[PDB]
Design a protein around this ligand. Sequence first.
Ligand SMILES: Nc1nc2c(ncn2[C@@H]2O[C@H](COP(=O)(O)OP(=O)(O)OP(=O)(O)O)[C@@H](O)[C@H]2O)c(=O)[nH]1
Ligand SMILES: Nc1nc2c(ncn2[C@@H]2O[C@H](COP(=O)(O)OP(=O)(O)O)[C@@H](O)[C@H]2O)c(=O)[nH]1
Ligand SMILES: Nc1nc2c(ncn2[C@@H]2O[C@H](COP(=O)(O)OP(=O)(O)O)[C@@H](O)[C@H]2O)c(=O)[nH]1
Ligand SMILES: [Mg+2]
Lengths: 53, 432, 430, 430, 132
Amino acid sequence: KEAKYHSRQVEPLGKRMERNYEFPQEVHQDNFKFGVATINSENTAKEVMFPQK
Amino acid sequence: MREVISIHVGQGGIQVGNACWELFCLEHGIQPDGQMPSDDAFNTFFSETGAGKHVPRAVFLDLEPTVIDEVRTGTYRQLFHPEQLISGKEDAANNFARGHYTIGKEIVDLCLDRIRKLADNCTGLQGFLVFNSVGGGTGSGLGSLLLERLSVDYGKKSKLGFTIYPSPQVSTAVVEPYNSILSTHSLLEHTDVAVMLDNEAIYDICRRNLDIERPTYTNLNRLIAQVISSLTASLRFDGALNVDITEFQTNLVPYPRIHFMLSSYAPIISAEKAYHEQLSVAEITNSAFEPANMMAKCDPRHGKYMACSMMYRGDVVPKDVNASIATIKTKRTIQFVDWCPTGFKVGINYQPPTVVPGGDLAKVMRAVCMISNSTAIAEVFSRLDHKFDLMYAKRAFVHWYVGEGMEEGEFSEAREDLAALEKDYEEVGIET
Amino acid sequence: MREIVHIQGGQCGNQIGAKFWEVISDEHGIDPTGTYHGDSDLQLERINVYYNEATGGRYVPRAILMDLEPGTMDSVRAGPFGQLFRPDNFVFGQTGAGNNWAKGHYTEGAELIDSVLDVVRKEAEGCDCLQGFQITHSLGGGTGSGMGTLLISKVREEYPDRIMETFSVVPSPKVSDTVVEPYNATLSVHQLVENADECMVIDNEALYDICFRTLKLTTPTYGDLNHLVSAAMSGVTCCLRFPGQLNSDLRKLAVNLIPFPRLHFFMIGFAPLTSRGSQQYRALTVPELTQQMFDAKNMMCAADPRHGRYLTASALFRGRMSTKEVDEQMLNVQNKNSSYFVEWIPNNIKSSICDIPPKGLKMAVTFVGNSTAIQEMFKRVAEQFTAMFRRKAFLHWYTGEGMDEMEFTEAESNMNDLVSEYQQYQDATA
Amino acid sequence: MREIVHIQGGQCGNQIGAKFWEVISDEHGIDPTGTYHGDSDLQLERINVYYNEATGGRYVPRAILMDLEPGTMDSVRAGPFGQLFRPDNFVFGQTGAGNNWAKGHYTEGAELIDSVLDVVRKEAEGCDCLQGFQITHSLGGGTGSGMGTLLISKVREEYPDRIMETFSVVPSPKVSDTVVEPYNATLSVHQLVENADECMVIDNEALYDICFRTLKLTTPTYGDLNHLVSAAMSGVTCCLRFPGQLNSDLRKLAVNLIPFPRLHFFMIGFAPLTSRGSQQYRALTVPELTQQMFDAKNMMCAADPRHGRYLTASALFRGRMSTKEVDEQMLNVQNKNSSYFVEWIPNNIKSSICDIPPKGLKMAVTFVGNSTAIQEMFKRVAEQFTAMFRRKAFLHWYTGEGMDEMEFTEAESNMNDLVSEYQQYQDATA
Amino acid sequence: TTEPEKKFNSTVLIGNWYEERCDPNREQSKFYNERKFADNNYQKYTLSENKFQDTSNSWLNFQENKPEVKNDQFITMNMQEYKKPSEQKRNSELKPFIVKKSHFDKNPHELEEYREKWTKSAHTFDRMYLGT
Ligand SMILES: Nc1nc2c(ncn2[C@@H]2O[C@H](COP(=O)(O)OP(=O)(O)OP(=O)(O)O)[C@@H](O)[C@H]2O)c(=O)[nH]1
Ligand SMILES: Nc1nc2c(ncn2[C@@H]2O[C@H](COP(=O)(O)OP(=O)(O)O)[C@@H](O)[C@H]2O)c(=O)[nH]1
Ligand SMILES: Nc1nc2c(ncn2[C@@H]2O[C@H](COP(=O)(O)OP(=O)(O)O)[C@@H](O)[C@H]2O)c(=O)[nH]1
Ligand SMILES: [Mg+2]
């Protein structure tokens, strides 16, 4: 009953301040881990020479 | 085959070692009982008991029983070896002479016995890590005595000191400048590498980046543990460019006296506002050098840079590292010492950071931990010298020290040593 | 026959060799299990140049992996093609050198080198008649730069008539990863110049430039760099292992590239190199192979070849072609760029032809050039060295393991003299 | 099957035997009802060594319980595992000895020993090939120290060829329990040097300090001390009962540890001993076992073994391990402690290996040592005896049964001769 | 600063408490989670037992509770090593570095995809020798 003081959902006891966002739960819940991207590795690296074709 | 021994003294060191040991155990997947559920990287920190669990290579020392007993009764009761948790009976009570002349002399023998019984099992000892808050009597005294004993008992083995100097204005005790300056004199000629960890900087980082306005000690300990893991991960995780403990002092120490470095870590963002951005390598390495993110309350813009060693962990690429370092060199606000054309050392590791459930930190691929030797560090020594001088002008609190057996004239020697140290810094900092 | 052994040290050298042996095995049709599975008879025709036989008919390379830290071999043994190497040949210390030249050359290297020298002696007496030694190492690392060159001295003092080959990866200031490259680099090259019969230099920044510009792939890797360097390795000796119009060995190159005994530092290059998307637009011809082989941007070094004059050049062609096109176009390129070729040595370009091209390609070219442009590398390295040394920075750690500043003074004086001597002939006129 | 019979008298001997038989039954899987319920077949080939077979498939120990008072046997029969002993092997008087050696060795012992001699003879020809006798008793008491030693004399007269070992609980000066120890202590110790082939000393003070320092248990009782002694004595004859790589019996130990007929006093020790907190936290290896077994404070005797030099030592490893490590451990401990070993005899440490570790462990070590530091206990006892005898205190109680001071003087003289002759080898140089 | 004799029941921090807390015969060994480990009263309304360490009842023969010990405690070298030449395998413990078990030994499928992946793939050996 004191939860809604505008001082609880802010500056809580050693915890995250409740910036209440809503993430897309269809993804993003199991093992997603931030970052810009997977730094997409260039297709073909070591067979550009000796093309094997 | 490669191992390092960890020493904790003073309740601050104990409480930060606790945080280090949740993090290492969770990183290696070991449950609190010490058993592994289901290669041999753990050999860096742990040792097989012969059948089943693993035991850490750590020792805890204190003259006050409460913290050690809380450790013995906490959730990690079944992990630590029972007779390496050395506890005394009566606390030093912020008196450096108490912890260095009367009470610590009785416990140093047991500590040395345990250190020997740990080192004989080890075969490829990399070195020692030591944790101790500086402003406390028992911490300073036992750190000094242990370091002095070890330097003559073992000789040339590397030793790393993770010291927490007092904040510029924020303070807890009222006499901690005295024991801080004394312990600094003691460890100046005994420690190969000492790092700065004044707490007010961590409070600022937690307030700004983590956005927690009332942080508790656990968060600070968690950050320090993350930094330790970042430093050490190269020994127990494969990487494209690995660096050992011995590959720190060979590249960070221009002169034998100058071995105090300050560290920074990045990225520090909560999971709440990290999903919204990308955190590329260039911006994380810029934030690493950004002055307010240094966990030492010193302004790097007020002095020159001497040497920078940075560890990248995750999926970083050497071309990206070179592209970032070129921009850092191009930037004008940061200038290096004249007689070092190149001053960067770079390490790269694959295993991305781990996150503790219920913690504040967030789980990314790319992380950077930077350790810098710079000429700007003289400010903290000057301000502590001033605080010492104001108190020592009228011999305040001197009786509490002189009645414990420590000689009156010892303070003058430490004062002269500090003056010599700042003289050496200002002499090195000039260009040719 | 005219057989040559492989030894390697330092992590950079081990990474280079771990892919060079892959290239050799792929060319000769040898599986990672050591059993031949090729199709042609010429594949086993000169397998002796690099391989030994064991009971049961399996092949083993004669390479000796040697250093102070076991982690890199712990990695490479689990890696691809790590099963070929003889498990006895691995020799590693338990301390590591910590990128300190003193620790890698005086206190740990001298102690450890007895076993590796013994195994080298055994492998040397094993062959019917040795041709020479070839080395892969990096000059920026402590254990490599020190222990490798000490081993070179020890091998030279016993085998004064054989050939010495070194592939040295020198530190360029553009991509710097350590703080102490100049010291150990100059210390290593001091001893290297007196004993090595041939040394050619490679640059990581130059390799990055090649990978960005010619192949145009967005994410280069150490594997890619090692592979192209290994192709350069193979192209030198392919003529020694396969028949051709004009067979030319290591001693051929030695007599034909070195006018004076102290000028044995080279820069190399490989052609063709094309991007994946443009590989079908190019129509493989000797003319374009030559124009690419002489491109300045295609060199594997930071040295700019048009900043100086070529003392001599050599080309190794692989594949089937007429000799008339090759030598006529060699004359053409010599005439059109006569300003960049020294005048008192007429006809200063070697041509050699081998009838077996590399895998998957019809024609290939390997270029080795001795020119005066390489002085810039030593100039910048010496500048860094003197900047660090004038203040005695990082010096007491080198001094604490038996050396003094007199050695460093001698090294810098010798290298400055070397640079002056190397540039002397550039302005020499007939 | 080279069996041995067991004899015990006095309260201490009865308690030690009660715990020893419990330990042996636990090792061999025997119920308190005497029914076998083991798992492996290795528990039955040598079950006849300690147990005779009765009707119904049950087993009975071949032990003799002897005393001057009925309370001791009334307690042991009521205690656990009291159903193993047959009622016939109990033998007791009705008067008691009262710590009076004369009463237990001249008046009551002489008239009572006929029955015990009869029963021990019956048990002796019960077995096919007797191996020897083992006795457990205390010298500081009356009935044990008198009647048991007189029985020792009689049995040695009857069987000169068999071997007799004794486990003697001597009075320790620190833990003083009775006021008339030195008299009967000297009187007993005289009568062992002529008969006992092996004697092993045990001290209650040493047991207490072991429990307080190594075990760190707050409230030890006599049960734990008995358990320690039972384990230590059981580890002696493991090789005789179980297969192993190097079998060794009591005769081997005697020949291998006795340089001269009058030096048959030993101090024993057991390993590994650790507290309850550190049960899982330390590793069981041959180096750790051999490091602990040679600790000065781990011995079962109050004497400090680092004040003298060993003549011979013997170790009986149990479990499965490598023999090279064992032998190298003895060689290392012999080289690092050359000052604590007599020099004119080389290789004075014996090794034995049995493949069956005790229940609840995986390796164990029993150590038996003959060293010149054992004489301190005899010197202290001699001092007490002389000081108490110069005033003829308590002497009339002994003289009241035809006992004379002439043989008191002879006993103390012979014991002093023992001390002198046994310590003169400490400084003997070849 | 020396050891004190027993003064208080095991449950306090007077000297030498840990051992008798580890001892299982004492009723103190086995404590409750709501005893300490408690943020607030309303969170939990039923106890749970946690037990103090994992120690056997008898100080000696302390390697009990390990199922492997009973299994391997009655084996000797002869039965261990001389079983039968038909189904005998080597039990010696070689040097760690010699048994690294490289990647292709770890997974064989890579091995047979390789070869026709990159071995014997499009070699063109043309020799201009007039006799050949
Ligand atoms: N960052 C951090 N600092 C701590 C911690 N604990 C104590 N400190 C600092 O240490 C200073 C005093 O030293 P303490 O560690 O508390 O105690 P001590 O050094 O062992 O000396 P004593 O008080 O005599 O026991 C305080 O001013 C704190 O700022 C901790 O857990 N984390
Ligand atoms: N070609 C190649 N060079 C590498 C690789 N890894 C590191 N290097 C080079 O090795 C140099 C550092 O050498 P270092 O490790 O100190 O030599 P060490 O002391 O003998 O181990 C760097 O300048 C890199 O350019 C690789 O995988 N391939
Ligand atoms: N270790 C041990 N010592 C005992 C035990 N019972 C008695 N003693 C020792 O034996 C001594 C007394 O022996 P005593 O009973 O008079 O021998 P007795 O007269 O022959 O029966 C005391 O000093 C005790 O220390 C026991 O159960 N265990
Ligand atoms: Mg405290």
